[PDB]
Symmetry: C4
Subunit: 95 residues, 4 copies
């Protein structure tokens, strides 16, 4: 399960890296703004302070959402079930 977590951890990192590079280059965002935008899109929060302005950006964002949501929320679920939950359970007991 640490190796199920590890795979989706890595995939998530690669996915956010892809969006950092694309949105920094094509749409002109700072590396940090691209990452932050990528995270806020794939988690569907979607604040809208940085939306894409070019048609290639609009198109890319359509695909990135469809390819990216399933992966991101799979990581979030494994994180919550396999990491967050046990550590909570462990706090409820003194060793």
């Amino acid at each position: 399960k640490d190796k199920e977590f590890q795979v989706l951890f890595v995939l998530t990192i690669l996915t956010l890296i892809s969006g950092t590079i694309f949105y920094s280059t094509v749409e002109g965002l700072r590396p940090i703004d691209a990452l932050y935008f990528s995270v806020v899109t794939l988690t569907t929060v979607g604040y809208g302070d940085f939306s894409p302005q070019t048609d290639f950006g609009k198109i890319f964002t359509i695909l990135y959402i469809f390819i990216g949501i399933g992966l991101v929320f799979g990581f979030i679920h494994k994180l919550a079930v396999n990491v967050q939950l046990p550590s909570i359970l462990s706090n409820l007991v003194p060793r």
Copy 2:
């Protein structure tokens, strides 16, 4: 399962086509902006750079969300489980 994927693939395309046509016509968006808006609504990202301005648009959007979310996220789940996952698993092995 390729035929389960195919059905929801097609339905999704038809759903986004319906929103492209409606938002291009009634709300006056470019074909590409309508599609992009339709995708960002049904995935619930909801950036808010293009929201509907007319009452018919507001009303249509209420129904489109309720009818459209269940379908879109069904496609996303089948895509992630039946397409993305196996291809990941296959990369972990050299043929």
Copy 3:
């Protein structure tokens, strides 16, 4: 199952009615804008063209989201599984 659908249908209507009344009165929106805002909040699309400006509105919105999301998305799931799916299946066969 028509009676499982009916219950969550009604509850959803009452939930959106509650937000229509509150956001029309306290925040000053048109009936139609309040409803549209209520739908876009509880489905988490959250465009942000109409956000609440008063502290009572901010507070109310915190509770409305927590009480309202679980219900809305339960309706959406039952709608997609018990209504949308069978009607799709039925189209694939000529009577």
Copy 4:
């Protein structure tokens, strides 16, 4: 189950408290605006009336979303299944 609900209730409160403090201090929001922003981020509504302006805020928000979504939506699910549902069922019967 009241004690499953209680744990996730408390955790949720602590999670929103953490975001209230951070966004009030670092980003300069009013206590009430920080809380409201924290709720609208972790439920992914993401209106975007208050987004973070500093790089430390941007970074913090990336982690807060990943750590916070799994917990918030776990509370929402338990609330809807273990509290909201039974009380609805009970209304359908006169004692």
